[PDB]
Structures are given as C-alpha cells and as structure tokens.
Symmetry: D2
Subunit: 395 residues, 4 copies
Amino acid sequence: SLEDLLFYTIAEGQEKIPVHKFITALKSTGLRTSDPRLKECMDMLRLTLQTTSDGVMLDKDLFKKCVQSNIVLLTQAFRRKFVIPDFMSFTSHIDELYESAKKQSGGKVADYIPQLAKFSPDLWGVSVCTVDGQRHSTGDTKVPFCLQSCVKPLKYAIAVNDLGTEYVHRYVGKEPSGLRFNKLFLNEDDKPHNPMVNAGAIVVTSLIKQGVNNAEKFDYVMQFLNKMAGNEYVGFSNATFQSERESGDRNFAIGYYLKEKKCFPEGTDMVGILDFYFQLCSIEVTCESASVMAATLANGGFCPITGERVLSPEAVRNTLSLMHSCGMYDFSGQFAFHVGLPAKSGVAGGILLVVPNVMGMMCWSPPLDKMGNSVKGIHFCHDLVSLCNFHNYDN
Amino acid sequence: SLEDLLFYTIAEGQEKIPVHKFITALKSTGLRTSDPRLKECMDMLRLTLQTTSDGVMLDKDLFKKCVQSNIVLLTQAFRRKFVIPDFMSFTSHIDELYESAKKQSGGKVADYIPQLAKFSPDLWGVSVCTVDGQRHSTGDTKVPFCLQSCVKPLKYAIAVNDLGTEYVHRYVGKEPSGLRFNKLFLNEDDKPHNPMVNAGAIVVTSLIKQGVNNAEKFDYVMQFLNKMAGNEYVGFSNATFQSERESGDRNFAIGYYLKEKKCFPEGTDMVGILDFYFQLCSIEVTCESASVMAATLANGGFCPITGERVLSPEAVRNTLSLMHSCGMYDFSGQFAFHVGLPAKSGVAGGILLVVPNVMGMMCWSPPLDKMGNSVKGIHFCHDLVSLCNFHNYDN
Amino acid sequence: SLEDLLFYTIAEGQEKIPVHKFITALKSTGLRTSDPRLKECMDMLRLTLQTTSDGVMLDKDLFKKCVQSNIVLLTQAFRRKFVIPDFMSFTSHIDELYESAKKQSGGKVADYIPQLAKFSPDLWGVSVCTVDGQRHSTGDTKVPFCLQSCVKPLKYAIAVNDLGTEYVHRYVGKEPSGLRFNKLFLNEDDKPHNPMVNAGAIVVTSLIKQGVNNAEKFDYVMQFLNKMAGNEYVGFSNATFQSERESGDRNFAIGYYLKEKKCFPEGTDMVGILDFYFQLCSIEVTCESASVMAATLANGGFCPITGERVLSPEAVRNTLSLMHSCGMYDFSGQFAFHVGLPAKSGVAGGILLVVPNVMGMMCWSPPLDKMGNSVKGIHFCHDLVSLCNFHNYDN
Amino acid sequence: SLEDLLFYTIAEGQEKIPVHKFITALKSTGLRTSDPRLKECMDMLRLTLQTTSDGVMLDKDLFKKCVQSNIVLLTQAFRRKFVIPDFMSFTSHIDELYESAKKQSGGKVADYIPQLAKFSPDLWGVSVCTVDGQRHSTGDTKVPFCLQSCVKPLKYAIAVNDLGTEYVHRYVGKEPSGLRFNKLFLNEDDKPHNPMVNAGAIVVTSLIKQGVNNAEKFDYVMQFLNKMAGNEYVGFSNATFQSERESGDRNFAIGYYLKEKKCFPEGTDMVGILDFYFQLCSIEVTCESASVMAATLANGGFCPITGERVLSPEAVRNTLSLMHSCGMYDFSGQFAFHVGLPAKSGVAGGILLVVPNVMGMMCWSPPLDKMGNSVKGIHFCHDLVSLCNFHNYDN
C-alpha cells in the first residue's frame, strides 16, 4: 500500500521508525509541525507519547493510524511534488543574501512619530512562505511592527472582492501617477489615479462594508486579515495609532480633497473613513504574518496554509496588476526594471514581496533611505533577483 | 528508424505517400513551405518533380533522402512538441476575434499628413507568428504601411545591445512618465523618463553607431531590422518620410530641448539625429514583417524563423520591461490592467503584441480613436485577452 | 471773516439763508448729513429746530455758531478742493454704467450652499465712497450679503500691521501662482505663494492675535473691521457660516496641507484657525460697508469718513501690491491688462475696487460667470475703465 | 521782452554775458549741448566763435538772435518747469547708490557663450534719461553690450503698434505664467501666456512686417529702434549673434513647439523667425541708448529727446501692463513688491527701468546672480526705491 511504501522510504532497511526521525524528516521538506492540515496527525502522535515513558516505535499499525487522517499532502511532500522540491538550498540563499544585506547599512530611522523613533537601527529579519506550505525565518521574524503602507493592496483586494472590479473602478483609476505617493491630484476625469497612492487607498477604504459604523468595519477587516494571515498574529499598535492619527496631516488633506470632488460613494462620513484608514495602517505584524498575507495575495486569493478562499480571482488579479505598476510608487518603474515582481513597502521598515504562483515574503529593517525604502530590504530584493532570476521578463 | 516511423505515421496502412499529402500535412501544423530551415528539403522535392510528368511516389528511399537534411524540426512538428501543439484552433479564434473587431468601427483617419489621409477606413488585417515557426494571416497581411511608433522598442533594444544596459541608462531614465508620449519634460536628474516616450527615443537613436554618418547608421539599422524581421519585407516610405519630416515640429522641439540640457553623448549633430529618427519612423512594413519582429522581441532576442541571434538577453529583457510599463504611454496602466502584455501602437494603424515565450502579433487598421490607438486593434486585443487568458497575472 | 464769506456764497443777494437750503447745498457736494465729523454741527441745527414751529432763518449769529465747530472741512467742501470737485457728473456716469451692466445678464447663481442659492438673479447694486468723504449709492446698497473672498486682503493687512512686513513674509510668499485660487501647492521654499490664494490666507489668519482663543480673535478682527468700515454695518451670516463650514472641504484640504509642511507659527491649532477663517469669510456686508473698507485700503490705511488710523502704511502698501498682482487670481493679469486697478471678488457677488488715492467701490450681483466673477460686476468694471481712464498705466 | 528777462536772469548786475557762462548754465539744468532741438542754436554759437579769436560778448542782439530759433524749451528749462526741477541732487543720489552697489559683488559671469565669458567682473555703469530731456551718466555708459532679453518689450510694442491690440492678442496671451521665462507650455486655449516669456516673444516677432524677408524685417526693426533710441548708438554684435545662434537650443525648442500648435499667423517660415529673433537679441547698446529707449517706452510712445512719435498709446500701455506683471519673470511679483516699477533684465548684464511719466534708466553689470539678474543692478534698484519712494503703490 501507499502507507507501506512511505514507511519503507522513511526507514533504511530497518523494522521500526522512531517518532523523532519522522518529525525531522517532515520538517526537512519545509512544512511546519504546527500546520493546521496536519493538526489531527500531531494530536495522535501526542496520544502515542502519553503511554510510553520515553520513545515509541511505529512499525506497521500506529504509523498507518496516524497517517490515515487526510493522507494527500504527505505523499506530495515526501514525493517532492511541491513548487520548490528543494527548500533547504533556497533557504541557504536567503541566509547568504540576509548576511550580505546586513553588511550594508546607513539611513535615517523615521522620526515623524516617537514610536518609530524607538527601534534600534539594527533589527533585520526575513521570512518567506511558499504557496504550498513551506516556511523559513531568519532573524527578527517575531518582533512586532506596524504594516503602515503594506496594507493598501489588502484594502483594494477586499473592496473589489466585496463589490467587484466594475463597480469599484467607477471610483478609483487604473494608471500610474508618475509622482510620489502622497501628492494631491486626480486623473483626467477627477478620479484617483490608482488604489496604491494614498488618495486611491483613502477612496477605497470607503467602499468596504458601507453603511455600518467604524467598529463593525474594523471587525470585518480584521476578520478578513486573520483569514488572510492564516490565523497568525495580526494585532493593533495602539501607541502607533495614537501617534499616526496625530501626525497624518497629509492624509487628512488628501481625504478632504477627495470628498470635495465627489470621489466618495453616496452618504459617507469622510472623517470616520480617515480614522478607519489610520486604524488599518496601525495593524501590527510579524514577518511571519505579513509573509503569509503576501503568499495569500500570491496564490489565488486563497490562503496558503489553510486551503481556504479569501478573495475572488478578479480581486487578486487586479491587486497584482496594480502592485506591479504602482507598488513602489514613482520608483516602481525602476524596481520592476531590476526586480520584476509585485512588492510593497512600509515606512516602518518591511518589504512584502509576491512571487506569483511561487511564494510570499516579508523582510523588516527600520532605518530608511531617502525614498522611504529600507536600505537592507532594497539590497536584499536586488540581490535575490540577481541570484535567483525571478524577474517577470526573465527567460 | 525514426524516418520509417514518420513515414508510417504520415501513411494510413498504405505503401506509398504522395508529395502533396506530405506538403498538406506539414502546412497543417503551422510551418510554412518557405521556411529557411526547410529550404534544402523543398529543393530536393523540386528535384523530384523535374523527372515525373505529374506526381511522384515516395515509399522508402526518396522520402528518407529528402528528410535527411536537418532532421530535427520535422520530428518535433509531427510529434506536437512545439509551444502550441494545436495552431488550427487558435487560428479559428483569431478569425472570430477578427470578425468581431471588424463589426465595430468609427474613428478618424489621421490627416496630419496626406499619405496617412489616403487609406480607406476599411483595411483591417491580422498576422501572428509563433516563437517556434508557426504563422497565420487574416486579411490585409501584405499591404504596406509605416511603422511610425512601433520602432521605438526596436531602437532601444539595438542601442543597449551594442553598448549594454549600464552605459545606455546613464542617458535615459527608467520610469513611466504618467503623461502623454509627446510631452516636453525630463525626470528628476534631467534625463528622459524612458526610451518609449518620444524624448527617450530621440536620445536613444543617438547612441546607435556613434560617429559615422546617417547613411551608415541607416544601413546598420536596416541590416539589424532585416535580420530581426527574418529577411522579410522591411522597406522605406519615401513619400511618408517626406510628409513626416515636414509635419514633425513636436519631435524637433523635443530634440532641441534634449540637446539643450546635455542629454546627448559627446559630439553629436542633433539635426542629423532627428532626420535619422524620422527615417526609422518611415520604415514600411507588412503585418507579416512586423509580426516577425515582434516574435524576435518575444523569443530571446533571437529570430524565430531563422535560428539566429540578434540581441543580447539584457537588451531584450530591458525592452520588454519598458514596453510593459510604457508601451501604450499614459494608457499603458489600463492596458496592462486588462491585457497584461507588452504592446506598441503606431498612428498609422498597427498594434504589435508580444506574448513572451509564446508569440508575436501585428494587427493593422488605419482609423484612430481619440487616444491614438486603432479602434479595431484595441478591441481585438481586449477580446483576445478575455477569450485566451493571456494576462501576465492570470492563473 | 471766512464764515461771512461762506454765508454770502451760500446766499444770492439776500439777507437770511434757510436751513434746508444749506442742507441741500452741503449734500450737493457729496458729503452726507450723517458724517461723524459734522455730528456736532447737525446737533446744533436740531437745537435750532426745537424752538421755531416750522422753519428758521440764520442771518449772522446762528450760522456762525453752528459752523464754528471744526470749521476746516466746510471751507474745502464749498471751495471744491477735494479730490473730485464735481461728484454729480461722476455719479451720472455710475448710473449710466449701472444701467448698461443691468442690460446684460446670464450666469449661474452659486448653489454649493443653499443660502447662496436663495438670491433672485436680479439684485444689482453699486456704492462708491471717496477717500475724502463723498458717497454715492445706486440700487441694492443696503441688502446683506457675505464678504466671502473679499476679506482676504483685510486679513493680510491686519496681520502685517500687527507684526510687520518682515516677520509675516517669513511665512507666506510674494509671487503670483499663475493658477486658480484653490489649488494645493506651495512655492519653491515650501511657502504659500501669496496671501490672496486660499492657502496664503489660511496661513495668514494664524498670525493675527496668536495665543488667545477664537472668541477673542473674532472680537479683535471685528473691532478692526468696524473701525475699517467706519462704524458701518459689519455683521455675521450665521446661516451662511453654518452652510460654509459644512461645504468647505477644499479649505480643509489646504489647511491640513499647510500644517503638514510646517507653514504655521509655533503652537497653533489648525482646526481652530480654519473655523476662524470661515467665520471671517461669513461676515455680512452692504455695498456701503464694503465700499468704506475699500476706501480705507485706498486712503493710507486710515479710514476715510472718520479721520482715523487703522493700518501702518507698510501693511496697506503690501496689501495693494498683492491685490494688483493676485486680486483676481489667474485672471488678474487680464484684469490689470484692461482695468489696471486693485480689485477683489467674492463668490456671493460683489466686487471691491480700490482706486488708490481716489476712492473705494463695491458692486454686488449674485449670479456668477464660469470664472467666479459676477457678469454685471466685470462689465461695470471694464466700462468704468473705458469711460473714465483709470488704468494704472494710462496717461 | 522774454529774451531780455532771460538775459537779465543769466547775468548778475552786468552788461555782457560770455558764451561759456551760458553753456554751463544750460548744462546745469540737465539738457545736453548736443540736443537735436537745440541744434540750430549751437550752430549759431559756432558762427559766433568763427569771428573772434577767443571769447565773445553777447549783450542784446547776438543772444536774441541765437535764442530766437524755437524759443520754447529754454524758457521752461530756465524756469524749472520740467518734471524734475532739480536734477543735480537726483544725480548725487544716483552716484551714492552707484557706489553702494559697487561695494557689493559676487556672482558668475555667464559662460554659455564665449563672448559673454569675456567681460571682466568689474564693469558697472548707470545712465538715466528723463522724459523731458535731462540725462546723466556714471561709469561704463559707452561700452557696448548686447540687449539680449531687454528687447522683448520692444518687439511687443512694435507688433501691437503695427497691427493693434485686438489682432495681436488673438495670438499671444495676457497672463503671468508663474514659472521661469524659458519653460515650454502654453495657456488654457493653447496660446502663449504673454509676450515677455520667450515663447510669447517668439510668436510676437512673427507678427512684425509679415510676408517680406528677414533682411527687410531687420531693416524695419532697426529703423524703429533708431527712432526709439533717438538716433543713438544701436548696433549689432555679429560675434555675439554667431555665438547665440549656436547656443540657443531652448529657443529652437520653444519655436518648434509654437509652430506645432498653430500659434503662428498663416504662412510663416518658423526658422527664419527664430533667426530674426536672435538677430534682434544681438543688438548692441550702450547705457545711453538703452536708457533712451526706456524713456521712450515711458513717455507716451514718443521719443523724449526728439519730440517724435514712435508708437500708438495702446501699444505702450499694453507693453507696460505686461512689463509690470511679467518683466522680471517668476521674480516679478517680488520685484513689484519692493520696487513697484516696470523693468527688464538681460543675461548680458543691464537692467532697463521705466518710471512712467518720469524717466528711463539703464544700469549694466556683467556678473549674474542665480536668478539671472545682475547683483549690482538688483541692489541699485532696491536702494533707489528705498531712498526715492518710487513704488507704484507708495503715497
């Protein structure tokens, strides 16, 4: 049987296979022991560890019993049929590029708010999660930090998912603006250029769950994010929220400018929308969570590590079409010239990279360059591209 | 042997295979009898037709003798190992979208020069050539017309190929401008935004074959185009050249603006460069030739139907990175929002589409919309995308 | 004596002069019987009318007694030594131009707020007050209406008067912007272009009476206006204030944009400043009052009909230097091309004209042209200039 | 008689008046012995000096005979009825401000052409000519230099004089642009913003003497200038012309941009117009000549020191209306904020100031500030204004 073949493959001319050997073999591929799809499996393993004082041998019966629950993924993992059969070498490349980026330095930690002028210019972490389930971490992959501007794609995806492409783009545009992200101006028919610049994001946040009050909207968006992050750590930075809402005069200017030109749906309180925008900008994340959200955007709109649907394919396709052409603002043309990937960046450090049909990635470094892009993150991106050949127009 | 297997496959329980049957079978796949790689083959067939008064039977020997010369491609063609195993159904889809675009109409034939105000608003043709050798035509696929603006990618590719990415982009920029293609303004460090807008193309044409006189430059570029078109019809529209050079005040303004800011290499005659630019804009093409050039840009920088190298991979990669983000100018964001492909358009009708690693395409229709894009061409592009799922961020 | 000479001049070979004859003669010149400088005089006349049942004759004594109080102005008025010796003919010209402007029509009454979409497109009034004391009215010269944008020069004058030119212009610029009045952008060193565009006025309103709360600021500015209007009707349009503060999204956008770039003094509440700005924009006026304020701006910074000082000469000079070059916004160049005068215009109808060293004028008409300038007001201005030769560069 | 009264006034209780005493007395007022209106007079004086070996006494007859010819101006000059009765004190003020400006220094002599990178950064001269005939000089008031940009008002005046305001302004605009003088962009209805920016001047030079060839146009304009300069030194800088025509890429860009949008009259050769523009820009002048041309612009369109008519009043009025609002380009708002006068400036050093109804002035200094305005010239202008109170909105 297939289970017997798997048992023989795990073993090497032996009778019994210890549990720890199987756990190490499973973790070798890239999947984590905490994977929800494997939950039942591990539970049974615990039921096996409750009897023996130390160690247990699984020859024929117990192994089959533990592997019986949802025996689909294990066959693929041990048969190397995922999108990246070898994750151990790509991980080594992550480590090499990580050290290489660490060697460089020199920027200016954002100080427009005190909570941002609080991180030492030394935190530098990376996390990656494949569309299939593999995950890797290196460094500060559990420290908290605000998403800041990494959430705008997530706003757009949800809005067009709820309403659909046609209704939404009656309100925001479709084109790169060619200028900075915080510039006050609209396209030819007095509409936001795209939902990645701040004005487009401010108009977009007003299409989500219209009518109900901000508490219900935040509950809705947090629910969507939690099933986007795959039930990972998505939090709230109340200190950062309080700082941002007081140092966000540019966003208030953009919001009133939009409201004046009738860029909003019928019957909207603009100020509540701005407060909601700041709330979403103030969602704390760890490179693990932001990487998982990236992979969700990358996969199909589904979540990678839960086998779940979160967005309609049109929403995700449009979000990537907008991230590739506006993800890095007026620098995007250069980024896609060298990197050729959809990516987003937050002033609080952090780059969210999507390799469509491959993986998602988040890499965090507080100190900023003059553009607003973490030096080590940009360096990691360029080196990753040079060594892995991930440009969208590579051969 | 392999030849015997091919002969049996062609035959149906018979002894001899007539020549016409084999010719029809070969043309069925998509390859043309005039393919250079098959030249020798067809020559031998003619040597076979010089003996018999009418018809000849090839059982074992003559078929093997004719197929011996370069027996690599035939095995793939009869084994359906190309990039599009079935070209007969895609051709039917081309026909359907062709008729659908023909049904629509309504524009304004360009009249800024008389030679353009000379085509009846009824010519509507399409041609496609796969990276492997397949070709299809429908309609006015041999009438002449000027490339106009479809040549700017071809200028950039050649320039960076001769000099390399690093030296060239010291002169032109890398970003979408966000405005029309004929606007006079440069990027932050007083450099052209990109080589697709007119200013970037005018600066780029001055990097090709520096020093020598315009006659030698035109011979050089025509040589490159001829081995880009695959030795197809690349001509010159002397009447159109004379009209354009007299109705090109915008390009002269851009050229002098560039020369003033020191956007040119050392020691360049600007006016000669502008005349050279108009000469390249005045290169006559038929949807066959422009399609072949598109497929060259699509393949690797190699020519599809000659197995030849014309450009370095860096040149082609950069040219596609610039066509996807500036190929349709300030409308490109919308085009890549719906079509998701590198494409270029000329005021003389004609859209050049590249499906990287798949094919190139040229579709010609004189009458223009307000943007400057042929109505039927734009409609064909959108319908092609909707029915074939060729968007770069499709699943 | 001088009084005897005046009495003989008033009389025509007679002994006694009736009071009504003298009153008519005085009103003929242009001065009003309610002039504060003449107050005492008229009071004595009333004391003379309390004795006789009807009519009283003033031969030598009573006339001298009544004229004794401040006998300076009367000598000039009866000696024709004012700036316009004949005010009866200029008044006829006002009437002619008034009817001529009335004949034309056709606009669009402002409807962005209901209080403005409340005047019938038929109100058309004019008032003029000379720097010396003469006043003329024609039509709706006592109906109320909001100043709207006619107050910005008055804000700038007061600000620079309190602080001085040097300190103030450290905050706002000095140049025409060349664009509309409600555009969001600053000059080269991120400062407002000038205090006439909305952004400059919003920054300027924050320099007046810094520190204290909005109630004290409004009391201060109303005091200044009342001694600017010459203790005429300066009111408040609470209904219009409530409408404006709810339909002023453009001004809120400008205000937040200014606050973001650090265009404000140290320690300012921006929102309170915006509310104060709307309060000043909502000050009701009648062509009499706005004309008197214009004449104040025209005279020296002094009030015309009270012999009082309200502004330092530097403040007034700078205010006129800014009204001539930015008073009508991006149309000002054309206005000064044909009219050659400092002028301001409000969306609520009303044009405030200053003929420096000559007079001030206010002309009210609700319906607007596409620019934002009342049709009849613009027509009156152009005709006034054509017939009176008041262009600043006339001979 | 009047002549006897003048003779007695010149004398001091004496019988005879020597010629040299009268010449000194005449030169004291400010008029020059070379004044054309006095020509005949001086001729007779020479006829008087041909008889006596040395010195001649004029008691009654010879003085009357010499003064008989056109005895109008002398009465005014000796009766102090000109516009500036005392020219000796204003001259002292010129000297004081001249030294004060000389004390400052520091710029960058223009080096875009070698002929401009040829003057030592030490030449500093001033000349003034009153509307009535007075003239004063201080320093390099006879060295040659090119007008450069001081000619654009002179082009506009002549164009609108020949054709009239209405026809001309169908081609150029009326508004300040708010940007630099060499920017490529047009107003709302695709027309030049005004005839002071380079584009407006290039369109304006094509309205003068249409149809005929460039030689006839240059003869026409030189004739007009010569009767504008009052038959003073107006020359041509052939070396500077040859340098400019080769370093004028910005003007060529502007010219082609204009021709493209149909901003020219019917049937014009654009390149000939550009060559004509450079020719007019290359007209050599000495502070004497440019001052005389300024005074012509200041007087009425008439020439000051010839009693001649050169321009229609509408032309001059419009030229001043455009110089006050666009004379110093994007700095004009600040200039009129502090100086309040029509003024023009050339990159070759030289400021041309008009005090309407008072005088014209030219002050030359090669080295430039960053704006393009000679440091010493700007300093002289500001100090002149501060000490003389010539601001247009002064009291």
